[PDB]
Amino acid sequence: GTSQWLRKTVDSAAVILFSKTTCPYCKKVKDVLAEAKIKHATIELDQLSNGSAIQKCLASFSKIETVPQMFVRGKFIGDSQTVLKYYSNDELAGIVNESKYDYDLIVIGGGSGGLAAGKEAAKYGAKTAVLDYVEPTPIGTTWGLGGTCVNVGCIPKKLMHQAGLLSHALEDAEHFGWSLDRSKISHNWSTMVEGVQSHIGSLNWGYKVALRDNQVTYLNAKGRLISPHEVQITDKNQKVSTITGNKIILATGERPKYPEIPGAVEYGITSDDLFSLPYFPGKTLVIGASYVALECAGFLASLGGDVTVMVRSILLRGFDQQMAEKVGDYMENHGVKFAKLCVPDEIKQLKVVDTENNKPGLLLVKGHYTDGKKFEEEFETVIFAVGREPQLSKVLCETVGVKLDKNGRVVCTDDEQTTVSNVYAIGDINAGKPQLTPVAIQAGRYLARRLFAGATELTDYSNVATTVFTPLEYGACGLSEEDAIEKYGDKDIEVYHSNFKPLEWTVAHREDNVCYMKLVCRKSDNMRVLGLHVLGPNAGEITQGYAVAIKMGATKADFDRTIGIHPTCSETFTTLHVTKKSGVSPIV
Amino acid sequence: GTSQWLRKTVDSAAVILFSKTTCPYCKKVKDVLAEAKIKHATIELDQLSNGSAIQKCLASFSKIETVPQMFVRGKFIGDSQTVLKYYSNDELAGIVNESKYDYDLIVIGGGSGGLAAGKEAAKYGAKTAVLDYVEPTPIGTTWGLGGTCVNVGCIPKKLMHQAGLLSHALEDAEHFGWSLDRSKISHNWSTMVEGVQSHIGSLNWGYKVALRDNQVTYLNAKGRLISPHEVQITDKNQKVSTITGNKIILATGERPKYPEIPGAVEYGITSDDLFSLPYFPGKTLVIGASYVALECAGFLASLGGDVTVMVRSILLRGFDQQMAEKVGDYMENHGVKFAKLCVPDEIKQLKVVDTENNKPGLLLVKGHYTDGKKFEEEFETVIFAVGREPQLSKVLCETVGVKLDKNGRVVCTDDEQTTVSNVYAIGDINAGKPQLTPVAIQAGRYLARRLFAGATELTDYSNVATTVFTPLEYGACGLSEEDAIEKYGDKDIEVYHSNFKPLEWTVAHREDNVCYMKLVCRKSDNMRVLGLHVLGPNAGEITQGYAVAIKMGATKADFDRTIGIHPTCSETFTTLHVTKKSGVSPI
Ligand SMILES: Cc1cc2nc3c(=O)[nH]c(=O)nc-3n(C[C@H](O)[C@H](O)[C@H](O)COP(=O)(O)OP(=O)(O)OC[C@H]3O[C@@H](n4cnc5c(N)ncnc54)[C@H](O)[C@@H]3O)c2cc1C
Ligand SMILES: Cc1cc2nc3c(=O)[nH]c(=O)nc-3n(C[C@H](O)[C@H](O)[C@H](O)COP(=O)(O)OP(=O)(O)OC[C@H]3O[C@@H](n4cnc5c(N)ncnc54)[C@H](O)[C@@H]3O)c2cc1C
Numbered sequence A: 001g002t003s004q005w006l007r008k009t010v011d012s013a014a015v016i017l018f019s020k021t022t023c024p025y026c027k028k029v030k031d032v033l034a035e036a037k038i039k040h041a042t043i044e045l046d047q048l049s050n051g052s053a054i055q056k057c058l059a060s061f062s063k064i065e066t067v068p069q070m071f072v073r074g075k076f077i078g079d080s081q082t083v084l085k086y087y088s089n090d091e092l093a094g095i096v097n098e099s100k101y102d103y104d105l106i107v108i109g110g111g112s113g114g115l116a117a118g119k120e121a122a123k124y125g126a127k128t129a130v131l132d133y134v135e136p137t138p139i140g141t142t143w144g145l146g147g148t149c150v151n152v153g154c155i156p157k158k159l160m161h162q163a164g165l166l167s168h169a170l171e172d173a174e175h176f177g178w179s180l181d182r183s184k185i186s187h188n189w190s191t192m193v194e195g196v197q198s199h200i201g202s203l204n205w206g207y208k209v210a211l212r213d214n215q216v217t218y219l220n221a222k223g224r225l226i227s228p229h230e231v232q233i234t235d236k237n238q239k240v241s242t243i244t245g246n247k248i249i250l251a252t253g254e255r256p257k258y259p260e261i262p263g264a265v266e267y268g269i270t271s272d273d274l275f276s277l278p279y280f281p282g283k284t285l286v287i288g289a290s291y292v293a294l295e296c297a298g299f300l301a302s303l304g305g306d307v308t309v310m311v312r313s314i315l316l317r318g319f320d321q322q323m324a325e326k327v328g329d330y331m332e333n334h335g336v337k338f339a340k341l342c343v344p345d346e347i348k349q350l351k352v353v354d355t356e357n358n359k360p361g362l363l364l365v366k367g368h369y370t371d372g373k374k375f376e377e378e379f380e381t382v383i384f385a386v387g388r389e390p391q392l393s394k395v396l397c398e399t400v401g402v403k404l405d406k407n408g409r410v411v412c413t414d415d416e417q418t419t420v421s422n423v424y425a426i427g428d429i430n431a432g433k434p435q436l437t438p439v440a441i442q443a444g445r446y447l448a449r450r451l452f453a454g455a456t457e458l459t460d461y462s463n464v465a466t467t468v469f470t471p472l473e474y475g476a477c478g479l480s481e482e483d484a485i486e487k488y489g490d491k492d493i494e495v496y497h498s499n500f501k502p503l504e505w506t507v508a509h510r511e512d513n514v515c516y517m518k519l520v521c522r523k524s525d526n527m528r529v530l531g532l533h534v535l536g537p538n539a540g541e542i543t544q545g546y547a548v549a550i551k552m553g554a555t556k557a558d559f560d561r562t563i564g565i566h567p568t569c570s571e572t573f574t575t576l577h578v579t580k581k582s583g584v585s586p587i588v
Numbered sequence B: 001g002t003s004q005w006l007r008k009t010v011d012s013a014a015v016i017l018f019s020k021t022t023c024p025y026c027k028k029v030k031d032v033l034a035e036a037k038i039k040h041a042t043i044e045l046d047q048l049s050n051g052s053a054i055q056k057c058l059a060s061f062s063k064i065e066t067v068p069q070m071f072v073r074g075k076f077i078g079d080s081q082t083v084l085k086y087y088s089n090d091e092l093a094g095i096v097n098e099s100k101y102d103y104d105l106i107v108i109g110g111g112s113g114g115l116a117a118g119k120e121a122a123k124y125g126a127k128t129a130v131l132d133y134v135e136p137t138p139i140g141t142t143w144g145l146g147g148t149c150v151n152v153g154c155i156p157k158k159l160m161h162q163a164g165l166l167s168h169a170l171e172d173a174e175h176f177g178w179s180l181d182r183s184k185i186s187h188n189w190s191t192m193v194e195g196v197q198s199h200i201g202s203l204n205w206g207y208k209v210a211l212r213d214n215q216v217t218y219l220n221a222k223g224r225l226i227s228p229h230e231v232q233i234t235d236k237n238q239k240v241s242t243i244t245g246n247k248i249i250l251a252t253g254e255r256p257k258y259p260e261i262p263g264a265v266e267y268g269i270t271s272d273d274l275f276s277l278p279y280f281p282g283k284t285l286v287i288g289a290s291y292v293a294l295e296c297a298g299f300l301a302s303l304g305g306d307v308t309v310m311v312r313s314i315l316l317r318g319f320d321q322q323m324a325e326k327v328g329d330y331m332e333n334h335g336v337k338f339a340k341l342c343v344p345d346e347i348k349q350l351k352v353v354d355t356e357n358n359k360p361g362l363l364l365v366k367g368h369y370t371d372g373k374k375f376e377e378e379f380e381t382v383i384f385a386v387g388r389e390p391q392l393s394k395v396l397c398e399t400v401g402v403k404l405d406k407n408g409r410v411v412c413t414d415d416e417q418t419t420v421s422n423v424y425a426i427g428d429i430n431a432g433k434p435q436l437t438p439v440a441i442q443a444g445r446y447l448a449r450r451l452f453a454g455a456t457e458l459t460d461y462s463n464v465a466t467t468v469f470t471p472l473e474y475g476a477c478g479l480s481e482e483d484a485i486e487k488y489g490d491k492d493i494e495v496y497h498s499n500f501k502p503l504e505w506t507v508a509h510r511e512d513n514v515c516y517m518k519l520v521c522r523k524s525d526n527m528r529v530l531g532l533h534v535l536g537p538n539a540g541e542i543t544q545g546y547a548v549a550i551k552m553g554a555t556k557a558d559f560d561r562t563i564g565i566h567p568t569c570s571e572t573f574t575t576l577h578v579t580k581k582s583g584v585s586p587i
């Protein structure tokens, strides 16, 4: 066990020093490496349980059993006297830079996972390249470094959500004694977009600065893996060339899908276009029912828009369906219209977009309901949110041998390894994993540490908490109620639940029994909490801390013995007592 | 073991049925008691792993070893045939109402703890009385049923905090594209107070409705315990009388202190007066530095007031002092003035309060700094927040034998029992316990279940989380950093920390490096989390869920393996890495 870890660590590390914290000879070598600006990993044997056994295994590579020992790309370089000899004779820089490959690591994709992986690898001396290119949308929209979340995802959508939440803050302020009149206040779309885009631009710049300051080579170029160690790159002038790397990380993400109907690509838009749109969308149709669809519909309605959502079957497929229906009922009561059990057949253009005067066009949408009946209505903007997909055929030559699944995602081991030994995949293209930004960041950073610093820790993909930022937010961690009943049977499942009213909603005359929470528990396992669900303000702040407790195996008794913080929404979880089986009402 | 539990349970339960879920004779007795509207506890022997032993122990009381067995106030009443005989002969009602005392339980004090205890006891058949009386403040302020939190504490102060937070929401809205002009908008104090008091009135009414619907006797009267089972009551006509009870729960809470200086009682006010005050305080001095002092100074400044806080020594004594200083620095940067190392000597009246035109008076405050230099300034309102105290001399005759500590609070065992066997104390008057509303509620409910339903669960008072609702909020769970170092030594403590910026603050152009969080950990115990601290928006919502993990013994490794929710403030706890020992900047 120890021997195999040491072999794998020595072969893979770029520059690694085996050391002890108490040894002055180690301190002397550390100081030389820092002065020469040579970055490296360090393994302190006097701080590992089995450091005595490791010291003996090292002799299989160096034929010495003492410390310090320095290695470069799998080769023993020397002890203290020898390293200092190389430094004195100006031979050290040459030794640490010799490599079979141009780079120790090439990352294809400059988004959530890829930037995290590349920065972390460079910290241990890995010579690293990060490649990023943004293929424009059909109407030509493009953006800078940072990936989907930064440019056209979590960041702009939550900022637009906050703009929508502030409409209710304006209404509430009157009841708390402020002299404004909400009815004579309006919203300016382009002022909001300008501010959102200025924040995104600071993140684009910050990432380029971060990469430069970690000695990472940033190439704004499209990458394609043509053999296990060769990446073909194409730059902004269509100049083609080839770079080589020891380890490869695929981190190229996904893009929005369009339905195969006339007029969709020509006249509709997606979330890729919405967040920098130079005109207010006007009267808008959202086609789809994912969290992207509902989040976007919700803030457009809160900003004063006329919004309709076209739903093929159900809302939020894959989420707890009691909770999804409560989310949708709140939206319908607060201005969002729904065309239920309905799909589109074609989009016709009635007016072209007026780019000079900053106005949308006009469109006729024709479709039909599920029994046979018809749909026909005019809209200024049509947004498609019908799923996302990778296009790895562009990124990856099939002759390399990387196995994909039926959906086109990469099949990986539990340490992110593909079917080709030196190639790994992280983020949204890793098949079967939750498609979330903090998952991609944890996978990338943890992988870099295993490759270049001898770490062993794996990423844990189970019970990852979520939040849907609809006008009333929905946070969750663990199983839906239906999935728990399916897995264990109804007689083994107990559900505790309650409505609640935020104290902030009392003076503001908001609704009594719309916010709601539940704990789905397994009777035969000490009332283990299988899933937690909350519909209410600040649901992501509420949910996050409980995800640590669920990771640790919390039971209902653990929630009961913990005391609440008053007055908060979250404290309601600490005193739940009404079961669904009892039939007693959950209202306040 | 089992036999001592059964004897304690039978002795104090008001009406209790020993039962099995599968027995039709027990169901028949259950159905009779429901039809006669007789409330009772039930213990299902087949749901307990030592139910066999309990069944054998019952025979020491009843001479029988079968179920059902029904007891009333320590006396075996009968099996199935016997209970049904009493029912059809119209004898059962008188049997279940037979008592040595007027009440099974008398609760003195109708606040957070006392209302919770009384309602829960009544659910198991305990015949219960709740007494509540509100002694008026020096200027005459009084209020309704529900205690300090409901009327003059957590509820009105967080509603006024929300009114303050909405001032910054109005400012932020401009940057997110809304057309308003924040500088043209003003605040109306009386409109806010009217809405707050209308909510408080709905709570007063709701508690009276709840006690009526649980068959609890509510007496709006002052109570005094004059022997272990006798409570002297005085009503709103000064009519004095005596009621008796088996068990007594003391739950009378605390009231604000005043300093012993000329003019303090005559011309100043406390938080008891602030939340119903008919005029805006105007230019205000807050004397003190508790969480009550800083919360009130903070929302008054956000509502447009000219506010000064005069601090004897430090802010938030007993809380982590790095966090306390960050809290105070934020308030000073957003318009609260501080007179540091300073105490008041006297308050002089320059104008009487104008009750007609609804205006405060005017006062001259004289004081001094610790080096002897003088303080002298005029204010319209002076609010004292210099601590709170019980006054059990009024509640409790010294000859009853209930022992108090040096501060006048009740010395209790870990099951809330006083030195008098039938008398218990809960809430703020229980010596050594955290003085918080959810603690008082848990202690009262769990105590009622042990007295009247045979429960065994104790309240756990360790690692109870808190939140200070200052303009930037401060949430905490566990030890301060200085307490962790004093208990374990500096070399055994590691602290992980980071600044952060809420996404909501980016477009609004708020501060980059003011929000802050840290985890205080013990190296030799697998990096156990000893304390969690966060300064930022919605800090109580952030902190609550982590209190469950700390209760369960969370380590730094547990925080690391849990994945964040993005974009949130709370997720910053899942990726902390900078240690204070390393000297690396947390920005
Ligand atoms: C509208 C929306 C809202 C979202 N909101 C949230 C939220 O609130 N919370 C959350 O946790 N997640 C959210 N997500 C999901 C989150 O954005 C993704 O899970 C995350 O961005 C995935 O990161 P990644 O590294 O796998 O890919 P990406 O971030 O998509 O980065 C991949 C990058 O590689 C580039 N690339 C592609 N092909 C090549 C090539 N051949 N050569 C070079 N570069 C290439 C791409 O253009 C892109 O820049 C949201 C997503 C969307 C669409
Ligand atoms: C300004 C302020 C803000 C606070 N904010 C919070 C917060 O955000 N969160 C939190 O958890 N806690 C907060 N607290 C603390 C909380 O209010 C108390 O911990 C809680 O009210 C204690 O409950 P209790 O049952 O011990 O007493 P109380 O709620 O004070 O109830 C005791 C009742 O008994 C009455 N009484 C007294 N003597 C007699 C007698 N002889 N006969 C009959 N009745 C009598 C009293 O008048 C009162 O009605 C705050 C306190 C203050 C002052």
Ligand SMILES: O=C(COc1ccc(F)cc1)N1CCCC1
Pocket (backbone or CB within 6 Å): B291, B432, B433, B434, B435, B436, B466
């Ligand atoms: O009363 C308290 C603290 O009380 C204790 C805390 C720890 C302890 F070991 C004992 C008592 N609080 C009221 C406001 C916030 C905290």
